UniProtKB/Swiss-Prot annotation, chain D:
Location(s), subcellular: Nucleus, Nuclear pore complex; Nucleus membrane
Chain's role: Component of the nuclear pore complex (NPC) that seems to be required for NPC assembly and maintenance. Involved in nephrogenesis.
Name by which UniProt lists this protein: Nuclear pore complex protein Nup85
Disulfide bridge partners, by residue number: none
Subunit structure: Component of the nuclear pore complex (NPC).
Family that this chain belongs to: Belongs to the nucleoporin Nup85 family.
Highest taxon of source: Eukaryota
Length: 375, 83, 365, 109
């Protein structure tokens, strides 16, 4: 509000809030973001700007309270979106209305480019299929639904050329990446399904689970660089972090945080800092996204962490671990618990970190903006 | 007018060349007395005229170049040019 | 010119012959030496601070001339016989010890020579703590005097008669050794340098006395070395110096107590620096650490200071060439930043050179 | 890393992170210029300007400046509040953004 970190009461559902690369990946500091207005009266994408401390690139004044720089309107709904380009933003809907908007950097405004009223088409037109998670990469944008419905769009043309509508069990919420011909989907119980680019008929291809602890998986995200790196956060913690994309059943088991994790975000600039939110009002910051071998920032959690340089050994006889294969002990480290906020907020929905600023939308219709001080 | 992005890598030779080009264009594109005085002072200093001056005045005339070379004792250059 | 010429070998014979080719020429040279040593650097008149800069410039020129003369002397003494040191000092080595050092040198009424000048510059003042008047005037005079004494004592056939005459005159060794510790100085570097030189010449005198079996001299040296309380100058000699505890260690009886304070060696140790002076050639912190380490590894070559540092202008030229060879097309507003970085690096390497001189003085001590 | 292609965003960001971890500058500038010319070919003026101000280059900056000049001469486009939202070294590298900022400040005053 007027002291310490920024706290605003926008009084609206904080669905999908993501920082745009307009003020990022440049000399300017990140401060401009976008928010979808899902579960409201009118699903509108609003571009806002926060107020950070100091002034390194003509930042906002006061002590906080973000302000809406612009807003766009569309008859479709708002689910989520993945920043494929700085000026292109593709948002899906649960009623089959894909909105591709054109953001002008030289104008700081939004223009309605494409509104696919007949999206998810491949053998005709006028098709309505709900969507749950839409993620983009080079050169395909993949959207998943609830009953296993998959939709694929190209980045070089404005058309849909792949719509697979099968009959799957349970419910799938989220989608990660692997390569140009593999898709890994998580279930709401603890199952992992591996599908190919050319799959016909019912019956999933490969289904795997984790022995021991099986909690409902919730949020799942992919690494912006290596696609085979997956960060998952569910109920009591059950992610299968792996630096590859082979093997049958996942040999990794990282069980921590009994509270339900609703979203786990990555650092877009330097993909080596993960930020995880808790349902009891907690924000954990993990370092070294598995592949990055560096000294860990404090332990915490049932994980193997990473190894660094070792020197100064006694003239006796030491050891250097061993080799074992089991589906119970962890294999890849990732969780680095950092005590930041034990219990301050009654509920927390989503969070997003960029450069040195973290936005956090809570379930009580509020937003918090905090400038990081650690590393 | 900074058409090409200036930098501390390239020396001031091209800068002076573009400056002379702009000055000649602002003054007169037909009068060659300025070029004459410039090349005369350069030869008095002790260095032949640059290659782009050579190309420009060769596309202009030729007999004047031959006469100036014969007067300034550039026998080999004048012989090659007349050949 | 003479110092730049005297750099080969087997050339000093010509000048040795031309120094004594004629008795009249030698007498005229001696008269000129007397006239030049009569007055060359007088206090107040020539050593002023409120008058003009002409006197200061003349004194600096005379000091540089003395530096070059001492350099020529040590360069001629470093080689084998013959040497120009004896010819320039006026006392050769072919004559016996009884006739080498003339007894008339140090009476203030005889032909002025090097010994007369040394007596005139080392007799005025207080020959006790904090040195006499030479340290108050210019410590470089005491520095060059200690250097000359060390160069004369390093030789086997020259250390004997020198200290013999110094002791038979007015006991100059005691007055020279009583200067510790030094207090009237302009820099701790010069202070510890003077302390190290005086300790070196005192140790070489102690070694020569122990080799020649001088019990009284060794006793006096050990007393002056292990003396704690500031004693008083005495003159009772049982054989050739101090031997009892009442004439050399009178400070204890004067203060009616004894401890570990106000001692010469203790004050020297408290004056010398304790921190380590690590000299760094080049250190940058404005770009990437990889490029910084690469530039540091590339700029590694010997010079004149003794370390892997470069010239004050050559390092900046190399840095300019390096930051110029790795560019693109846009380079506006970077020249003032580069100049500021060059100035900061120059100040840094100047401070590191000062630390290197401090470390060299500490290593000498 | 300069011979491998740097066209797709995935491998572009991969090489960018690789050279950033290696702590280099020439490779960073080369990747930025490549992605800037790609954005210019794909008609992305804002992305090209961001890449140019990241690479500290002025060629693409002056190109976008001349594009803005001819756009204003054709129709008159001046509503550019990006400079008022955020600043940096682009106003020193170019002159069109500085002119737009000065015009907006003059209008507000």
């Amino acid at each position: 509000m007027a002291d310490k970190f920024a706290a605003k009461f926008v009084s609206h559902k904080i669905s999908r809030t993501r920082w745009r690369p307009v003020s990022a990946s440049s000399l300017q500091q990140p401060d401009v973001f976008a928010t979808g207005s899902w579960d409201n009266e009118e699903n509108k994408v609003c571009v806002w700007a926060t107020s950070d401390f100091g002034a390194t690139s003509l930042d906002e004044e006061y002590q906080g309270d973000p302000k809406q720089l612009c807003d766009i309107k569309h008859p479709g709904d708002v689910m989520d979106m993945q920043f494929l380009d700085k000026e292109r933003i593709v948002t899906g809907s649960s009623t089959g209305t894909v909105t591709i908007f054109r953001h002008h950097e030289n104008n700081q405004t939004l223009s309605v480019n494409q509104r696919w009223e007949q999206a998810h088409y491949h053998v005709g037109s006028n098709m309505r299929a709900p969507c749950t998670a839409i993620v983009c990469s080079s050169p395909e944008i993949v959207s998943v639904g609830e009953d296993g419905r998959i939709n694929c769009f190209r980045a070089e043309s404005r058309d849909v050329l792949r719509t697979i509508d099968d009959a799957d069990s349970s419910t799938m919420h989220g989608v990660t990446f692997l390569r140009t011909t593999e898709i890994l989907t998580v279930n709401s119980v603890g199952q992992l399904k591996l599908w190919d680019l050319r799959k016909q008929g019912n019956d999933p291809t490969q289904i795997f689970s984790v022995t021991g602890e099986r909690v409902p998986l919730h949020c799942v995200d992919r690494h912006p660089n290596q696609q085979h790196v997956v960060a998952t956060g569910g109920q009591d913690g059950m992610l299968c972090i792996w630096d590859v994309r082979h093997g049958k059943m996942p040999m990794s088991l990282l069980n921590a945080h009994e509270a339900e994790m609703w979203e786990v975000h990555f650092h877009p600039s330097n993909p080596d800092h993960l930020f995880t939110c808790s349902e009891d009002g907690s924000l954990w910051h993990w370092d070294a996204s598995a592949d990055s071998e560096k000294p860990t920032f404090l332990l915490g959690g049932r994980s193997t962490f990473n190894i660094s340089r070792s020197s100064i050994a006694p003239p006796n006889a030491n050891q250097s671990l061993a080799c074992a294969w089991l589906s119970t002990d962890p294999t890849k480290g990732q969780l680095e618990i950092t005590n930041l906020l034990p219990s301050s907020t009654l509920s927390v929905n989503s969070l997003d970190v960029l450069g040195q600023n973290l936005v956090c939308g809570t379930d009580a219709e509020a937003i918090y903006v905090t400038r990081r001080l650690f590393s | 007018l900074a058409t090409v992005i200036t930098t501390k890598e390239s020396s001031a030779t091209d800068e002076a060349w573009r400056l002379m080009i702009s000055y000649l264009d602002k003054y007169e594109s037909k009068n060659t007395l300025y070029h004459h005085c410039i090349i005369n002072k350069l030869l008095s200093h002790g260095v032949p005229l640059p290659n782009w001056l050579i190309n420009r005045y060769k596309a202009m005339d030729a007999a004047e170049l031959l006469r100036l070379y014969l007067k300034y004792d550039l026998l080999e250059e004048a012989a090659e040019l007349v050949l | 010119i003479l110092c730049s010429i005297s750099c080969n070998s087997k050339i000093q014979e010509k000048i040795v012959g031309d120094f004594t080719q004629d008795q009249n020429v030698s007498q005229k040279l001696m008269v000129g030496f007397v006239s030049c040593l009569d007055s060359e650097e007088a206090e107040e008149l020539l050593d002023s601070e409120k008058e003009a800069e002409d006197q200061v410039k003349q004194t600096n020129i005379r000091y540089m001339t003395k530096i070059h003369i001492l350099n020529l002397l040590i360069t001629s003494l470093e080689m084998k016989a013959p040497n120009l040191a004896m010819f320039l000092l006026g006392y050769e080595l072919k004559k016996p010890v009884s006739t080498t050092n003339l007894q008339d040198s140090g009476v203030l009424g005889c032909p002025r020579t090097c010994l007369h000048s040394i007596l005139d510059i080392l007799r005025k003042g207080t020959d006790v703590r904090a040195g006499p008047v030479a340290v108050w005037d210019t410590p470089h005079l005491a520095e060059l005097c200690y250097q000359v004494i060390y160069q004369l004592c390093a030789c086997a056939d020259t250390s004997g008669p020198t200290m013999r005459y110094l002791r038979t005159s007015q006991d100059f060794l005691f007055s020279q050794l009583q200067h510790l510790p030094f207090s009237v100085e302009e820099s701790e570097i010069s202070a510890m340098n003077q302390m190290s030189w005086l300790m070196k010449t005192a140790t070489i005198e102690l070694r020569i006395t122990s080799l020649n079996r001088q019990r009284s001299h060794t006793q006096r040296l050990l007393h002056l070395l292990l003396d704690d309380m500031p004693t008083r100058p005495y003159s009772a000699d049982g054989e050739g110096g101090m031997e009892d505890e009442s004439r050399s260690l009178s400070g204890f009886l004067h203060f009616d107590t004894t401890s570990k304070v106000r001692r010469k060696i203790l004050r020297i140790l408290d004056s010398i620096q304790f921190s380590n002076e690590i000299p760094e050639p080049l250190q940058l912190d404005f770009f990437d650490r990889s490029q910084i380490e690469q530039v540091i590894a590339n700029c590694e070559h010997k010079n004149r200071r003794g370390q892997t540092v470069c010239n004050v202008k050559l390092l900046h030229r190399v840095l300019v060439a390096e930051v110029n060879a790795l560019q693109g097309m846009a380079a506006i507003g970077q020249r003032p930043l580069l100049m500021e970085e060059i100035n900061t690096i120059l100040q840094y390497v100047v401070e590191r050179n000062k630390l290197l001189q401090c470390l060299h003085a500490k290593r000498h001590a | 890393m300069e011979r491998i292609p740097l066209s797709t965003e995935k491998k572009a960001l991969k090489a960018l992170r690789i050279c950033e971890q290696r702590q280099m500058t020439e490779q960073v500038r080369s990747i930025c210029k490549t992605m800037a010319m790609q954005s210019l070919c794909n008609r992305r003026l804002g992305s090209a300007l961001s890449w140019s101000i990241r690479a500290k280059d002025a060629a693409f900056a002056t190109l976008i400046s001349d594009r803005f000049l001819k756009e204003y001469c054709e129709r008159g486009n001046f509503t550019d509040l990006d400079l008022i939202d955020n600043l940096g070294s682009a106003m020193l590298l170019s002159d069109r953004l500085t002119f737009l900022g000065k015009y907006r400040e003059f209008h507000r005053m």
